[PDB]
Amino acid sequence: ICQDVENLQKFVKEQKQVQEEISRMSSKAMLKVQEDIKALKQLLSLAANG
């Protein structure tokens, strides 16, 4: 049994690591995009009006 808790907390925690891992990983790259396509669309309107 107390082999036991040595492992389970270990597999659980191993998992929290991945949770951290995702947490480390987070977006600005994404936020960037809408701004750009919103911007490119506008230049296209230029060229078109030109």
């Binding site: 808790v5 659980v12 929290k16 949770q19 995702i22 947490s23 977006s27 994404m30 995009v33 809408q34």
Partner: protein
């Protein structure tokens, strides 16, 4: 029962979080399409 307690609350705590994050990604994917 010191320990088991620790398990659940950690569990629900992270779960409540994981939930919110998945959602993030959903909303990000969201924005992608």
């Amino acid at each position: 029962e010191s320990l088991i307690n620790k398990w659940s609350l950690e569990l629900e705590d992270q779960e409540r979080h994981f939930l919110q994050q998945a959602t993030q990604v959903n909303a990000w994917d969201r924005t992608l399409i």
